[PDB]
Amino acid sequence: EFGTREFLTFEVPLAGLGVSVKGNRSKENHADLGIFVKSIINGGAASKDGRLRVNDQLIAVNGESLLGKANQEAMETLRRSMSTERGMIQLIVARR
């Protein structure tokens, strides 16, 4: 249910992004599919900026890639990369 996705990038000015994310997994194929935007908190930084979209797959944060990582490791990478962040988050996403 991933489709054919294009890679997009944008800069999000800045608590936090105000974004909830979740790992997706196919149980029939026993495969992690990546980290996806589940909700954008109304009135948070990503909401005010408008360029992030629900169901986007998160690919990179400030150049730190989430690819080649199981969902647990990618989530940890996300948290670690956001822990050091007025500011600017450069996101790479994959969008259907």
Partner: peptide, 5 residues
């Protein structure tokens, strides 16, 4: 399983 950033 759901994290908020």
């Amino acid at each position: 399983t759901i994290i908020t950033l």
